Design a protein around this nucleic acid. Structure first.
Ligand SMILES: [Mg+2]
Ligand SMILES: [Mg+2]
Ligand SMILES: [Mg+2]
Ligand SMILES: [Mg+2]
Ligand SMILES: [Mg+2]
Ligand SMILES: [Mg+2]
Ligand SMILES: [Mg+2]
Ligand SMILES: [Mg+2]
Ligand SMILES: [Mg+2]
Ligand SMILES: [Mg+2]
Ligand SMILES: [Mg+2]
Length: 182
RNA sequence: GUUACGGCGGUCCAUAGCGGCAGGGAAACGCCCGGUCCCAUCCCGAACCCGGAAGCUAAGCCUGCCAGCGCCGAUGAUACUACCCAUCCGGGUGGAAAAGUAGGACACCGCCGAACAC
């Protein structure tokens, strides 16, 4: 009875546009976004685990889902890290949660991006993938700026079903992220 | 009986794998649609589980073709060696490799269950 505007968009207009613009043999060659990944590894828990709790608090308030933290999958003396210390916080999505969060992000954080300049095609990998790292956490609405103690990191990435980068870029710009003009 | 079907199985388990190419949705197979109730995410219906069959075979699977690569492999010879030898010095009979070579080769088969025919 309730469902996200991007879900509808995908069903009716994005799918039709991509089909027309690439002449797929079948309807569903249309790649579809698979997983929005939201993790973080500070690397500072090796000296103090207090900041990890705050980062997870930010992740929970941003998502409402309870992020996990992983240990030192290997151990490195140079990084002063031993296996078993928690360094990486994760929080994942799927489906309606994926696209509600994506709509909120596109509507709020992107126009809210200080000195926003658009994102380039070239950080793809040719297989329809898209991932990079957030300047600052404070960009988000539900988070409180008066309570942020130290500027820490967040990431909410997107992925595709695209076989190559061509379809990935086509559908992604159809969704309408701010690609550069070069 | 046929089948361009699904499970379980075999086999001194790659002649049976990998790679590229083409094709399959009647049923079955996958993907698939949504999470009140079972159940699960060290979060997520991603995994699993559950309700249903709107859609499609792209992925995966299958089958068919390709020698690009894996792969099997002669005869012959060579290496090797059991025994015996001749005043060292290597031969006589027996055994006979590895690699390389012509080539072979894009599995075969069993029991049930599904669509066409009797
Ligand atoms: Mg993709
Ligand atoms: Mg049918
Ligand atoms: Mg789901
Ligand atoms: Mg296909
Ligand atoms: Mg496939
Ligand atoms: Mg071999
Ligand atoms: Mg082979
Ligand atoms: Mg012989
Ligand atoms: Mg003797
Ligand atoms: Mg002699
Ligand atoms: Mg031989």
């Amino acid at each position: 009875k309730a469902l996200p505007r991007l879900k509808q968009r995908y069903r009716e207009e994005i799918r039709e546009a991509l089909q027309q613009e690439f002449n797929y043999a079948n309807v569903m060659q249309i790649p579809g976004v698979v997983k929005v990944v939201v993790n973080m590894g500070v690397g500072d828990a090796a000296r103090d685990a207090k900041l990890i709790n705050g980062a997870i608090n930010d992740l929970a308030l941003i998502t409402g889902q309870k992020p996990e933290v992983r240990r030192a999958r290997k151990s490195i003396a140079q990084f002063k890290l031993r296996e078993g210390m928690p360094i990486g916080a994760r929080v994942t999505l799927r489906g309606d949660r994926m696209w509600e969060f994506l709509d909120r992000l596109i509507s709020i954080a992107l126009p809210r991006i200080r000195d926003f300049r658009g994102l380039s095609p070239k950080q793809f990998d040719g297989t329809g993938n898209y991932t990079f790292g957030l300047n600052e956490q404070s960009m988000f609405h539900e988070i409180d700026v008066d309570s942020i103690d130290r500027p820490r990191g967040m990431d909410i990435t997107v992925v595709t079903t695209a076989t190559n980068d061509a379809e990935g870029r086509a559908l992604l710009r159809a969704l309408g992220f701010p690609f550069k003009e070069n």
